[PDB]
Structures are given as C-alpha cells and as structure tokens.
Design an enzyme around this catalytic site. Structure first.
Site, mmCIF file in Angstrom:
data_model
loop_
_atom_site.group_PDB
_atom_site.id
_atom_site.type_symbol
_atom_site.label_atom_id
_atom_site.label_comp_id
_atom_site.label_asym_id
_atom_site.label_seq_id
_atom_site.Cartn_x
_atom_site.Cartn_y
_atom_site.Cartn_z
ATOM 1 N N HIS A 1 -7.744 -0.067 9.319
ATOM 2 C CA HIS A 1 -9.116 0.111 9.946
ATOM 3 C C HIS A 1 -9.418 -0.595 11.195
ATOM 4 C CE1 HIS A 1 -10.970 -3.302 8.044
ATOM 5 N NE2 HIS A 1 -12.422 -2.900 8.554
ATOM 6 N N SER B 1 -13.508 -8.765 8.110
ATOM 7 C CA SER B 1 -12.440 -7.874 7.099
ATOM 8 C C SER B 1 -11.252 -8.623 7.365
ATOM 9 C CB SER B 1 -12.362 -6.670 7.785
ATOM 10 O OG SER B 1 -11.111 -6.681 8.778
ATOM 11 N N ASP C 1 -5.398 0.915 2.653
ATOM 12 C CA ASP C 1 -5.915 0.498 4.178
ATOM 13 C C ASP C 1 -5.608 -0.933 4.597
ATOM 14 O OD1 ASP C 1 -7.709 -0.021 6.445
ATOM 15 O OD2 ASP C 1 -9.168 1.146 5.465
#
Lengths: 154, 51, 155, 144, 152
Positions: free
Chosen positions: C32, C106, C54
């Site tokens: 992402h 992240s 992801d």
C-alpha cells in the site's frame, strides 16, 4: 602510505570491489574490476579502454589536475611501499608476503619510499612470498604488463 | 477460425488461472522458509524445497 | 532496539512514508505504501507482488545475505519489543498503547526478546485505551497469514 | 541562523549556487542550473519566470510553516558573507553566491542574483514600496 | 485550570469531542455527537448553522451566571490550554505539532476567556495550523479553514 586518498575505491553493489588510481593526471582502473568509481567528479569521465594493458584511462578534470600521483620508470630491486605492506622487487619480479591481498586489492598502486613504480592487477601464490601480476613500466618507460604464469585477476 | 479462437482463449485463460493458483500456493511457503511444505502441495503446486 | 537498523525507510516525494525490512534473506515492504527504499543495493531488486498479504517481497542480493533477521512462529502471549516500545500480545492480537504509531510506521518489524521477528506491522485500529495492530504473521503451522482486527486502517 | 534554510544547489558535484524558500515558495534563479541538494524540494517542478529570472514553486505540504518570511520595507542588512541610493552594494562574494537571500529582525528583503563591481553592486530581486516584485539589476551586472 | 463547567461529550465511556457553555449559551461543533453528563443540560434544543459547523442553544436560567466569558481580543502570542500552549500569529491559530488532536474540537482557548473555537487542524512540519471559527475584524462570525484541514 598516507598519500593514498588520491587513490579512490570503486564500488560495485555498494561494497568496495577495487580501486581506481590517479597517476599523471589520468585515472586508471583495470577492466577486470567492473563497477563505479566512488566519486561524483570522477564518475563522469569517459574512460577509454586498453585491453592489452588491461587499463581504462581517463583525463582528470582541472580541479584535481595538480593533485595527482606522479610515476617513475626507475625500479631498482628492493622494497616499495604498498597499502597492504611492502613489495619486494627481485629477479625482475614483484612479490609480497604469502597471504596478503587478493580479490579486491587490484588497482591499488605500488609506490616507493612516493612516486608510482607499478600498479597491481593480480597475483599467483609463488611460495611463501606471493608473486604479483603488475602493469609495470619498462626501463625505457613504455608501459608493459608483467604476469607470472598462471596468475589470476584480483 | 472460431474453433482455434475459442480453444486459444480457453487455453490461455486456463493457464493463467492455473499459474495464478500456483503463485497463490507457493507464496505463503516461499515467504516463510522455515515451515514444512506439505507433501501433497509439494508435488501438486509443484515446488522447490526452500531453505 | 539495536537490530532496528536493518529496516530502512522508503522515500515518497522526498518524505518517509513507510519502511522495508529484511528477514530470511528476503526484503519485504508493504504494498500500500509507495516510494523507493532508502539504500542503493536494495533499491535495485525488482520487488515481486503479494496482494493477498499486502506485501511486496524480493530476493535480497548476494553480498548481505548473512546480514538479515531471523523469524519464528513461536509466539507466546506477552510483551514483545518494537521500535516505539513494547507491544502486548494476548487473545491472538498484538496491541500497542494508544496513539503510538500511525502514518509512516508501516513495515516496522515487531521482534521478540531474542531478536527474531514475529510480525511486520501494516495498520491499526484504536480500540479504547489501546490500539491493535494489523500485521503479517506466521501461524502455528508457520505459513504466512495477514492478521487484521476489524476496522484496521492502513498506515 | 536561518541561513540553514537556503539550500545549496549542486551541479556536477559543486556549489553552482543556492536556492531559497520565502513566503512558502521555493526560488531558484534560471542562470544557475543544477539539481537542488534536497530531496523534499527536488520533487517540486519549478515554473519559470524569465522576467524576474527566477523559477519558483509552491513548497511541499510538510514545510509551509518552515519558510523564511519577507517584507518590502528597506530603509537604506545581513547576508551570508556579512551589505543599501536604492542599490545593494558590498569588493571581495563572487561567482557562486547566486540565490543567496539577504536578511534583515530575520526578514528577507531581497534575493541576490549577480553583480557588477563598482570596484561592488548587487543584481537583486526585491519587492517595491507598493509591494510588487521587481528586479533591480545594475548596468554591467554579471550573473553569478 | 474552573474545570467543573467543562463537559466531555460521551460515547461508550470515552471522550469524542467538547461542547462548551459560553456566555449563557451552549455551542458545539456540528460534526461531533453525544450527551452532556448532566441531567439538566442534555435535553436542550440545539439549532444548526451548517456553514459554520456550529450548533448553538440557550443554557437554562439557573446556569446563566456560572458560564465562562468570551472576548474577541486575540493578539499574537501564547494562551493556556489543558495540554499546554496555543499560539496566535499572522491570523492563524497555530500549535506546536503533536499537542491537541481528535476529540479536541470545540475546545475553548483560555488566556480564562474564550476567543476562538477550534474545529480542525492540519499538522504542518513543526506546527499545526488550526481551522477555527472566529469573529472577523468587524465582529462578524467567520470560519478560517486552512487548506486541507481535517476536523478534529
């Protein structure tokens, strides 16, 4: 020994793969080392190849023009300083202690007690000194390659 | 011409589906090298043994 | 805390928006999040895609294979170290204190005491006085599995 | 102290000049080409203005509050190297100090682009009494 | 640091926003929801100004004399707040980044008088610029919204 940051480590994939030595207003690197010089200003010059001598050579910019190693074709047999230690020239043969140098140490100059006397490209383990493959410059001063039999690039 | 066309599109779509599934089979194990790759999966979604 | 070096940031329009982490001789990075990993040797590799987790994953090149983290699926509940602090694992859920982490965190590995990675964080949802992390872990059998508490928002 | 926030341009690995952020926009003179030595300003695409000899552009989102601030009131000021008949002069900053803002209470009242030795006047961009931007370039100015 | 008057707005035992009684009238941000933890206050009819994202009503007569006062004089500088300092400068309400946040909207800013009612923000570099509903130079109510402000 200390006047060696004229010599510049080339980099291939981030780790030092060899060294490119500035002598005589000219940047030299050996063909067998592939990669990039670790210097932006030196990163530009179009390097013209010479396989027979196994050198790629380039005219340095002005900003280092006066700040370049000198050379010499006078090579009496004896000790000549080199980054990893001394080299001994005898029987028209350049040698080092057995077990020092190897992959990566190609393209580092040999200097005397400080002009370049040779630029090294490889070597074969002779004995308990290890013979080297060097592009020396003959007594007439024309550049020549000097390979003990069976030496391999570093 | 129609029949070669329909077999072509079916075969390509089938192989695409299959190779998709092959990826979606190996990738969990690919990513996790230290697990055991079940023998059935090993032979069917045919796999290299990772380290 | 000291092994956190081996995670390196990605640059997106010049700012850090995430991190790529190297484990098991394989560099990972959340899908992402976009950018280019902030170093040269790992900038080169074509990163393969894994939508269902992801995670873009790639085969780290040769000369720093021995310079990577290790991982196990052995995850007893308790406190586990992580960049910003401790993460408490309980009732099959990783949760950090409220407000710590967010946009840009992240790809941050979550380690155990012995430096082995247990998960990579991809998102979060703030529940009550804690915030539960949507991560990528390995189950008891050890296959990779995305774990998402309901309402996790990507970071 | 705020001179940190004039970011040196590089071209071919040397300081060809500088670029500055004032009023929430970045500024780079045309004459001095180069890649800006800053990643977060590298990705702004600079829209040119020849008539002021400055490519400029809105600064990215995350530095709107970290720009220097200007003002047009310049009574006959500080500058990187140490500078005002409605003319900026300083003999012995030269070839590379292009784009160097000239600060004032920490307000920028000009950006330097070049000069002519009055054996030394500065070719500059300023903002007039009514506040519109203008170039003031002495006769015989050379760019730097 | 007169904290009785301040009521958080309640969902599920956690704080989602702040509605304040100023000058004998209750104001709240329209986008925040919930109930005052006070039997008398919670039933009052509230009337909407959508353009301003502001809900207002009249507080009961019993509490009219026990409400914080407001004032429109806001020179640039520092103001007190529960978590720290609030900056005014250049017609922006600015705060150092990372103090203040979600569930803070509608909070009155104290010197103790209310001068501006924060509705949102955007966190920019070293400083968060506050989207706030104010009184203009003529005393008219006006929203100041920095570009890209996420309501708090």
């Amino acid at each position: 020994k200390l006047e060696s940051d004229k010599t510049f480590p080339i980099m291939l994939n981030g780790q030092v793969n060899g060294y490119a030595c500035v002598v005589g207003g000219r940047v030299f690197k050996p063909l067998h080392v592939e990669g990039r010089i670790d210097n932006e200003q030196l990163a530009a010059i179009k390097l013209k190849k010479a396989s027979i001598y196994d050198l790629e050579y380039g005219d340095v910019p002005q900003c280092m023009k006066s700040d370049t190693l000198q050379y010499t074709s006078d090579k009496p047999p004896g000790f000549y300083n080199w980054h990893h230690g001394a080299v001994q020239y005898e029987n028209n043969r350049f040698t080092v202690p057995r077990g020092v140098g190897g992959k990566g140490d190609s393209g580092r100059p040999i200097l005397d007690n400080g002009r370049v006397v040779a630029i090294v490209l490889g070597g074969v383990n002779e004995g308990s000194r290890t013979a080297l493959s060097v592009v020396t410059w003959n007594q007439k001063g024309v550049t020549v390659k000097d390979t003990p039999e069976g030496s391999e690039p570093w | 011409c129609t029949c070669v066309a329909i077999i072509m599109v079916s075969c390509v779509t089938s192989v695409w589906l299959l190779c998709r599934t092959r990826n979606l089979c190996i990738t969990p194990y690919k990513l996790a090298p230290n697990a055991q790759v079940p023998i059935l999966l090993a032979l069917l979604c045919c796999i290299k043994p990772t380290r």
